[PDB]
Design an enzyme around this catalytic site. Structure first.
Site, PDB file in Angstrom:
ATOM      1  N   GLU A  62      -4.735  24.006 -82.486  1.00 54.57           N
ATOM      2  CA  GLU A  62      -4.397  25.403 -82.270  1.00 54.57           C
ATOM      3  C   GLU A  62      -5.347  26.297 -83.028  1.00 54.57           C
ATOM      4  O   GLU A  62      -5.803  27.285 -82.503  1.00 54.57           O
ATOM      5  CB  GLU A  62      -2.959  25.686 -82.690  1.00 54.57           C
ATOM      6  CG  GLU A  62      -2.469  27.088 -82.374  1.00 54.57           C
ATOM      7  CD  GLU A  62      -1.427  27.651 -83.357  1.00 54.57           C
ATOM      8  OE1 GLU A  62      -1.640  27.606 -84.623  1.00 54.57           O
ATOM      9  OE2 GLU A  62      -0.404  28.170 -82.833  1.00 54.57           O
ATOM     10  N   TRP A  84       2.301  26.091 -76.835  1.00 59.62           N
ATOM     11  CA  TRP A  84       2.195  27.343 -76.083  1.00 59.62           C
ATOM     12  C   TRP A  84       2.457  27.213 -74.583  1.00 59.62           C
ATOM     13  O   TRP A  84       2.380  28.199 -73.865  1.00 59.62           O
ATOM     14  CB  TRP A  84       0.806  27.963 -76.299  1.00 59.62           C
ATOM     15  CG  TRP A  84       0.646  28.600 -77.636  1.00 59.62           C
ATOM     16  CD1 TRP A  84       0.279  27.999 -78.779  1.00 59.62           C
ATOM     17  CD2 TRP A  84       0.807  29.986 -77.927  1.00 59.62           C
ATOM     18  NE1 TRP A  84       0.221  28.918 -79.801  1.00 59.62           N
ATOM     19  CE2 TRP A  84       0.532  30.153 -79.298  1.00 59.62           C
ATOM     20  CE3 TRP A  84       1.166  31.115 -77.159  1.00 59.62           C
ATOM     21  CZ2 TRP A  84       0.595  31.408 -79.937  1.00 59.62           C
ATOM     22  CZ3 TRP A  84       1.225  32.372 -77.793  1.00 59.62           C
ATOM     23  CH2 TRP A  84       0.931  32.502 -79.174  1.00 59.62           C
ATOM     24  N   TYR A 110      -3.761  35.927 -80.069  1.00 59.11           N
ATOM     25  CA  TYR A 110      -4.606  35.678 -81.248  1.00 59.11           C
ATOM     26  C   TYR A 110      -6.076  35.456 -81.073  1.00 59.11           C
ATOM     27  O   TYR A 110      -6.837  36.126 -81.658  1.00 59.11           O
ATOM     28  CB  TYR A 110      -4.066  34.607 -82.171  1.00 59.11           C
ATOM     29  CG  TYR A 110      -2.658  34.699 -82.599  1.00 59.11           C
ATOM     30  CD1 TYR A 110      -2.295  35.361 -83.725  1.00 59.11           C
ATOM     31  CD2 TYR A 110      -1.691  34.069 -81.900  1.00 59.11           C
ATOM     32  CE1 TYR A 110      -0.985  35.413 -84.126  1.00 59.11           C
ATOM     33  CE2 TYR A 110      -0.392  34.101 -82.290  1.00 59.11           C
ATOM     34  CZ  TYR A 110      -0.042  34.774 -83.405  1.00 59.11           C
ATOM     35  OH  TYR A 110       1.267  34.788 -83.762  1.00 59.11           O
ATOM     36  N   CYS A 170       3.379  36.858 -84.315  1.00 59.15           N
ATOM     37  CA  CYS A 170       4.089  36.716 -85.597  1.00 59.15           C
ATOM     38  C   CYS A 170       3.205  37.015 -86.736  1.00 59.15           C
ATOM     39  O   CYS A 170       3.656  37.584 -87.715  1.00 59.15           O
ATOM     40  CB  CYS A 170       4.585  35.304 -85.837  1.00 59.15           C
ATOM     41  SG  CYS A 170       6.059  34.947 -84.903  1.00 59.15           S
ATOM     42  N   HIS A 171       1.943  36.611 -86.633  1.00 63.64           N
ATOM     43  CA  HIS A 171       0.989  36.782 -87.727  1.00 63.64           C
ATOM     44  C   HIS A 171       0.255  38.064 -87.534  1.00 63.64           C
ATOM     45  O   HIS A 171      -0.806  38.100 -86.936  1.00 63.64           O
ATOM     46  CB  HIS A 171       0.034  35.608 -87.759  1.00 63.64           C
ATOM     47  CG  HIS A 171       0.724  34.296 -87.695  1.00 63.64           C
ATOM     48  ND1 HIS A 171       0.299  33.278 -86.869  1.00 63.64           N
ATOM     49  CD2 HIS A 171       1.856  33.870 -88.290  1.00 63.64           C
ATOM     50  CE1 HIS A 171       1.124  32.254 -87.001  1.00 63.64           C
ATOM     51  NE2 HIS A 171       2.080  32.593 -87.853  1.00 63.64           N
ATOM     52  N   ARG A 190       5.479  38.766 -89.685  1.00 65.45           N
ATOM     53  CA  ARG A 190       6.575  39.695 -89.419  1.00 65.45           C
ATOM     54  C   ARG A 190       7.891  39.037 -89.134  1.00 65.45           C
ATOM     55  O   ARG A 190       8.933  39.648 -89.316  1.00 65.45           O
ATOM     56  CB  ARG A 190       6.221  40.580 -88.220  1.00 65.45           C
ATOM     57  CG  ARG A 190       6.227  39.832 -86.910  1.00 65.45           C
ATOM     58  CD  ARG A 190       6.118  40.742 -85.736  1.00 65.45           C
ATOM     59  NE  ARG A 190       6.064  39.906 -84.552  1.00 65.45           N
ATOM     60  CZ  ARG A 190       7.092  39.321 -83.977  1.00 65.45           C
ATOM     61  NH1 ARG A 190       8.314  39.461 -84.455  1.00 65.45           N
ATOM     62  NH2 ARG A 190       6.895  38.544 -82.930  1.00 65.45           N
ATOM     63  N   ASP A 193      10.572  31.725 -88.494  1.00 64.31           N
ATOM     64  CA  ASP A 193      11.564  30.684 -88.319  1.00 64.31           C
ATOM     65  C   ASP A 193      11.352  29.669 -89.436  1.00 64.31           C
ATOM     66  O   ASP A 193      10.425  28.868 -89.374  1.00 64.31           O
ATOM     67  CB  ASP A 193      11.399  30.010 -86.955  1.00 64.31           C
ATOM     68  CG  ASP A 193      12.433  28.894 -86.710  1.00 64.31           C
ATOM     69  OD1 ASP A 193      13.254  28.567 -87.640  1.00 64.31           O
ATOM     70  OD2 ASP A 193      12.434  28.330 -85.569  1.00 64.31           O
TER      71      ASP A 193
HETATM   72  O1  LIG Z   1       3.754  31.124 -84.942  1.00 60.72           O
HETATM   73  C1  LIG Z   1       4.929  31.422 -84.799  1.00 60.72           C
HETATM   74  C2  LIG Z   1       5.417  31.964 -83.508  1.00 60.72           C
HETATM   75  C3  LIG Z   1       6.843  32.296 -83.413  1.00 60.72           C
HETATM   76  N1  LIG Z   1       7.752  32.071 -84.552  1.00 60.72           N
HETATM   77  C4  LIG Z   1       9.148  32.475 -84.399  1.00 60.72           C
HETATM   78  C5  LIG Z   1       9.914  33.490 -85.169  1.00 60.72           C
HETATM   79  C6  LIG Z   1      11.065  33.810 -84.381  1.00 60.72           C
HETATM   80  O2  LIG Z   1      12.109  32.966 -84.754  1.00 60.72           O
HETATM   81  C7  LIG Z   1      10.638  33.524 -82.984  1.00 60.72           C
HETATM   82  C8  LIG Z   1      10.031  34.734 -82.365  1.00 60.72           C
HETATM   83  O3  LIG Z   1      10.827  35.852 -82.490  1.00 60.72           O
HETATM   84  P1  LIG Z   1      10.364  37.289 -82.174  1.00 60.72           P
HETATM   85  O4  LIG Z   1      10.076  37.814 -83.527  1.00 60.72           O
HETATM   86  O5  LIG Z   1       9.186  37.173 -81.214  1.00 60.72           O
HETATM   87  O6  LIG Z   1      11.409  38.222 -81.596  1.00 60.72           O
HETATM   88  O7  LIG Z   1       9.708  32.457 -83.088  1.00 60.72           O
HETATM   89  C9  LIG Z   1       7.291  31.546 -85.845  1.00 60.72           C
HETATM   90  O8  LIG Z   1       8.027  31.356 -86.821  1.00 60.72           O
HETATM   91  N2  LIG Z   1       5.854  31.231 -85.883  1.00 60.72           N
END
Ligand SMILES: O=c1ccn([C@H]2C[C@H](O)[C@@H](COP(=O)(O)O)O2)c(=O)[nH]1
Ligand SMILES: O=c1ccn([C@H]2C[C@H](O)[C@@H](COP(=O)(O)O)O2)c(=O)[nH]1
Ligand SMILES: COc1ccc2[nH]cc(CN(C)C)c2c1
Lengths: 287, 285
Positions: A62, A84, A110, A170-171, A190, A193
């Site tokens: 990735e 993805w 990205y 997210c980043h 931002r 998970d």
């Molecule tokens: O690289 C990544 C891409 C996605 N997510 C997560 C966070 C959220 O749980 C979900 C996406 O939520 P949104 O913030 O898009 O609403 O997937 C990550 O942790 N890392």
């Protein structure tokens, strides 16, 4: 001197004890805290988490995919890495109103922002040579010529392009910093998970820092991980409580097996994870 | 368990003890740490620092200036607030190769990005109505219709526009978050002068959060302040060591004196800082 993984595990404990119930788009629900920061040393160690095996091949393929400027999910899928694919599928693209778009076209995500920020996105197969700002290369140039600079930043968050993306990033951004020949990196994430993504994400940017350090002849320093919405999904709580029982093993090392001049020239075979002894993976559901 | 102003003072102590000596663009030199975070509660309190008086009128007029979309330093200067004037001066603009630009034209800075992100910047006097993304209004709309959203972000960092700016932004981005009717805000600040700027910067975004909370009928929650290069200039160390010896007084409150429907309608007279009892200012170059 305590193990770096205890910061991640500490954030899990803090969310479990102090996090608040919050609903999301999928209606699973979450426990959530807003605003966290962890610091992972990269000096003679690589922060690939040991309490659960992290998908290393995914991290590496990735990252190389991002660096190529690719926005084609099929191109990452060819390398064995499916993470993805759901976001590039005909069904998922149709649910966003991109009926005319070819399968796998994630939009200006990205790869596009790092290499062609501000260029007009047409499709994944298009030629973007010399269009937009090449943030990745400008970071590398600035580290070489003016290491003390405080503007060494790479931004994936582009409000103009958001409606074309399959997923908003997210980043949001990352910043670099140099002192005493050591390169450090801070990442503003931002949404995190903590069960599935975060360990992977730590590894992604630790690896980016190692790559840029090598091109610029610097030693890796710290990786600082800053989170906005840091959440655990409710179906991940029992799995996570199991993971918290495990004593971490020492972090592995990352060897870079040859001298490499430009960041475009790195290949998967150039990297060796040495000493990685994770505990067994635990299952955790996504979408 | 340290709270409020003790977080800021704690960051000063950490930089003094653990920071590394580093040169910068001006060659004055700094002690520096990379990556810090502080959390300031906004519940029945406003985090205007008491160990040194913070320039409140400046915080408020500048924020209202940003919100208008203004990029004209002279417009902020008219209100008594000179902090952007040097960056809009004929000499400073000429040193960046902007010989054709009128004095005070800072380029596409905060105001422009918050209101017209991605529009073609011409000059400060131009009409940008309906052009670009209005991030500020989109933040407000999303807080109202979908508070659980994790994409409530306002970004000032625009790599395409950087070469036109008189100064690249310190405040790269900020993110909002809602839970139990409380609005919180996190700010990513890439570079922080802990002596002069940071107290002012905390106040700027605490105030932004109070304004947006009011428009959206929410209570203020936390302000989270995240820093990249967090530094103290070497000529500020003796002044800062004096400041660390002062006991903080309770934070003041901020009253919003009337009901206000749109963020564009806030005016300086709408705001009242009540109970502000700072120690005397210490001078810092
Ligand atoms: O690289 C990544 C891409 C996605 N997510 C997560 C966070 C959220 O749980 C979900 C996406 O939520 P949104 O913030 O898009 O609403 O997937 C990550 O942790 N890392
Ligand atoms: O609102 C502001 C604007 C600027 N600075 C600072 C940080 C640095 O000392 C200097 C900017 O230097 P650079 O980071 O741009 O190199 O001004 C602040 O703290 N707050
Ligand atoms: C060519 O026009 C575009 C397309 C996408 C963009 N994203 C950010 C910008 C900023 N620019 C207006 C300076 C942009 C411009």
């Amino acid at each position: 001197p305590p193990h770096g993984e205890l910061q991640y595990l500490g954030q899990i404990q803090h969310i479990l004890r102090c996090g608040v119930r919050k609903d999301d788009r999928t209606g699973t629900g979450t426990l959530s805290v807003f605003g966290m920061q962890a610091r992972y040393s990269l000096r003679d160690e690589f922060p690939l988490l040991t309490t659960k095996r992290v998908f290393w091949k995914g991290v590496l393929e990735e990252l190389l995919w991002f660096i190529k400027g690719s926005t084609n999910a099929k191109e990452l899928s060819s390398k064995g890495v499916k993470i993805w694919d759901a976001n590039g599928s005909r069904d998922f693209l149709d649910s966003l109103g991109f009926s005319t778009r070819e399968e796998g076209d994630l939009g200006p995500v990205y790869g596009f922002q790092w290499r062609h920020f501000g260029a007009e996105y047409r499709d994944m197969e298009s030629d973007y040579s010399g269009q937009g700002v090449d943030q990745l290369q400008r970071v590398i140039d600035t580290i070489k010529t003016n290491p003390d600079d405080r503007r060494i930043i790479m931004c994936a968050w582009n409000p103009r392009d958001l409606p074309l993306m399959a997923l908003p990033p997210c980043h949001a951004l990352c910043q670099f910093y140099v002192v005493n020949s050591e390169l450090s990196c801070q990442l503003y994430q931002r949404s995190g998970d903590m069960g599935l993504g975060v360990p992977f994400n730590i590894a992604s940017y630790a690896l980016l820092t190692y790559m840029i350090a090598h091109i610029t002849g610097l030693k890796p320093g710290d990786f600082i991980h800053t989170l906005g919405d840091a959440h655990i999904y409710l179906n991940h709580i029992e799995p996570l409580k199991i993971q918290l029982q495990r004593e971490p093993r020492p972090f592995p090392k990352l060897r870079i097996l040859r001298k490499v001049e430009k960041i475009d020239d790195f290949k998967a075979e150039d990297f060796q994870i040495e000493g990685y002894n994770p505990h067994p993976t635990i299952k955790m559901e996504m979408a």
